Motif scaffolding. Structure first.
Motif, PDB file in Angstrom:
ATOM      1  N   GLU A   1       0.805  -1.151   0.076  1.00 55.32           N
ATOM      2  CA  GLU A   1      -0.135  -0.057   0.176  1.00 55.32           C
ATOM      3  C   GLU A   1       0.650   1.322   0.199  1.00 55.32           C
ATOM      4  OE1 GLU A   1      -3.714  -1.699   2.668  1.00 55.32           O
ATOM      5  OE2 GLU A   1      -3.925   0.026   1.560  1.00 55.32           O
ATOM      6  N   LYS A   2       2.056   1.022  -0.722  1.00 51.29           N
ATOM      7  CA  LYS A   2       2.957   2.255  -0.495  1.00 51.29           C
ATOM      8  C   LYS A   2       2.651   3.087  -1.846  1.00 51.29           C
ATOM      9  CE  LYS A   2       7.184   1.198  -0.006  1.00 51.29           C
ATOM     10  NZ  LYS A   2       7.203   2.400   0.663  1.00 51.29           N
ATOM     11  N   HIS A   3       3.518   4.114  -2.056  1.00 47.14           N
ATOM     12  CA  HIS A   3       3.475   5.096  -3.159  1.00 47.14           C
ATOM     13  C   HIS A   3       4.848   4.955  -4.075  1.00 47.14           C
ATOM     14  CE1 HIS A   3      -0.266   6.199  -2.297  1.00 47.14           C
ATOM     15  NE2 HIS A   3      -0.055   7.449  -1.564  1.00 47.14           N
ATOM     16  N   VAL A   4       5.225   4.107  -5.035  1.00 46.73           N
ATOM     17  CA  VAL A   4       6.469   3.661  -5.577  1.00 46.73           C
ATOM     18  C   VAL A   4       6.467   4.597  -6.848  1.00 46.73           C
ATOM     19  CG1 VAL A   4       6.287   1.358  -4.668  1.00 46.73           C
ATOM     20  CG2 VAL A   4       5.598   1.872  -6.969  1.00 46.73           C
ATOM     21  N   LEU A   5       7.980   4.972  -7.262  1.00 41.52           N
ATOM     22  CA  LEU A   5       8.271   5.610  -8.586  1.00 41.52           C
ATOM     23  C   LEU A   5       9.334   5.075  -9.193  1.00 41.52           C
ATOM     24  CD1 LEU A   5       8.085   8.270 -10.267  1.00 41.52           C
ATOM     25  CD2 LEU A   5       9.649   9.448  -8.536  1.00 41.52           C
ATOM     26  N   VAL A   6       8.795   4.216 -10.468  1.00 37.16           N
ATOM     27  CA  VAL A   6       9.822   3.452 -10.896  1.00 37.16           C
ATOM     28  C   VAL A   6      10.462   4.543 -11.871  1.00 37.16           C
ATOM     29  CG1 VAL A   6       7.940   2.678 -12.504  1.00 37.16           C
ATOM     30  CG2 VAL A   6      10.244   1.514 -12.235  1.00 37.16           C
ATOM     31  N   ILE A   7      11.862   4.526 -12.312  1.00 35.00           N
ATOM     32  CA  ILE A   7      12.419   5.264 -13.102  1.00 35.00           C
ATOM     33  C   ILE A   7      13.250   4.267 -14.081  1.00 35.00           C
ATOM     34  CG2 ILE A   7      14.002   7.142 -13.583  1.00 35.00           C
ATOM     35  CD1 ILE A   7      13.263   7.982 -10.847  1.00 35.00           C
ATOM     36  N   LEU A   8      13.124   4.241 -15.387  1.00 42.76           N
ATOM     37  CA  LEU A   8      13.728   3.393 -16.070  1.00 42.76           C
ATOM     38  C   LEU A   8      14.737   4.176 -16.991  1.00 42.76           C
ATOM     39  CD1 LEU A   8      10.695   1.083 -17.299  1.00 42.76           C
ATOM     40  CD2 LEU A   8      12.137   1.257 -15.147  1.00 42.76           C
ATOM     41  N   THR A   9      16.015   3.740 -17.446  1.00 40.84           N
ATOM     42  CA  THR A   9      16.771   4.482 -18.284  1.00 40.84           C
ATOM     43  C   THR A   9      17.432   3.638 -19.622  1.00 40.84           C
ATOM     44  OG1 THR A   9      17.674   5.151 -15.983  1.00 40.84           O
ATOM     45  CG2 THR A   9      19.169   5.287 -18.011  1.00 40.84           C
ATOM     46  N   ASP A  10      17.335   4.630 -20.578  1.00 39.04           N
ATOM     47  CA  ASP A  10      17.947   4.185 -21.727  1.00 39.04           C
ATOM     48  C   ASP A  10      17.345   3.220 -22.404  1.00 39.04           C
ATOM     49  OD1 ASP A  10      19.887   4.693 -23.916  1.00 39.04           O
ATOM     50  OD2 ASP A  10      21.432   3.992 -22.741  1.00 39.04           O
TER      51      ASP A  10
END
Lengths: 250, 50
Positions: A34-43
């Motif tokens: 029940e969190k608030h995740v922020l995924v960041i993908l590169t290239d």
């Protein structure tokens, strides 16, 4: 912070398995904690290249530009794992990054990425070449959910009008610099000098922040109002008078 | 230099050799002086127009 690394030495197939692990982890954290995740993908260009190599090794017939036909479906199944779920207090936000070969906006990778996703943010060579960090070119930068992301309560009541005014002022200033380039600085009005002053101060303070100057939203709007203070409220024709009587005389 | 193109203009000059003096025409110098003033102002405005 969870961190996943895949150096360019490692096997090319591991390139197209790293994203799946990252997304599965983000899912499990988002909808089981029940969190608030922020995924960041590169290239993502390297992702595309690795997928291309897998396809060519698999003997399949090539698609457009040598990239496989179902690149659309594949990027769809990678990007589409996000949003919000009814009844679960959590969310997933995606910020993929990618490089455009030859600065070509019609290259397939950015084209498909734009189609599947919502919004876009640019960086411009010239601005980096003006030694401005972060070189973020707001003129072609758009957004899709800005209207509903912000509002009274979750922020101040003075956001959207401020954004519109900053954009309008900056566009006027830039095209006006283009005008003065040939019209001569002598024929310029004083308000014209005010527009140039807005241009230079906006590029000097609002955009330039420095690698560690952690600005908040409220600081950002404070600087925005300060930059707007240069002119009178009469020129600021995108702001409603009701908020002018409150914020402009500060 | 009105724009990127330069256009010639002019300036009103009082060279220095004063307007001549006719004091014998039955002694009417005052009217001649005010006429001098009138045509001088006119010529100023005319060089501006030119």
């Amino acid at each position: 912070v969870c961190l996943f690394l895949n150096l360019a030495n490692d096997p090319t197939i591991e390139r197209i398995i790293t994203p799946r692990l990252a997304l599965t982890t983000a899912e499990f954290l988002a909808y089981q904690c029940e969190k608030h995740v922020l995924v960041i993908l590169t290239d993502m260009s390297s992702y595309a290249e690795a997928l291309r190599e897998v396809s060519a090794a698999r003997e399949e017939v090539p698609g457009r530009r040598g990239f496989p036909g179902y690149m659309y479906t594949d990027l769809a199944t990678i990007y589409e794992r996000a949003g919000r779920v009814e009844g679960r207090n959590g969310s997933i936000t995606q910020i993929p990054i990618l490089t455009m070969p030859n600065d070509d906006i019609t290259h397939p990778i950015p084209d498909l990425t734009g189609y599947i996703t919502e919004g876009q943010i640019y960086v411009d060579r010239q601005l980096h070449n003006r030694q401005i960090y972060p070189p973020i070119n707001v003129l072609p930068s758009l957004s899709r959910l800005m209207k509903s992301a912000i509002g009274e309560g979750m922020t101040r009541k003075d956001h959207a009008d401020v954004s519109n005014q900053l954009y309008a002022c900056y566009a006027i200033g830039k095209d006006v610099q283009a005008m003065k380039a040939v019209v001569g600085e002598e024929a310029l009005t004083s308000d014209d000098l005010l527009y140039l002053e807005f241009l230079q101060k906006f590029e000097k303070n609002f955009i330039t922040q420095g690698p560690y100057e952690n600005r908040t939203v409220y600081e950002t709007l404070d600087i925005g109002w300060q930059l707007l203070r240069i002119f009178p409220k009469e020129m600021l024709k995108r702001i409603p008078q009701s908020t002018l009587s409150e914020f402009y005389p500060r | 230099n009105v724009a990127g193109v330069t256009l010639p203009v002019f300036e009103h000059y009082h060279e220095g050799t004063d307007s001549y003096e006719l004091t014998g025409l039955a002694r009417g110098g005052e009217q001649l002086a005010k006429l001098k003033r009138n045509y001088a102002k006119a010529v100023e405005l005319l060089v501006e127009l030119a």
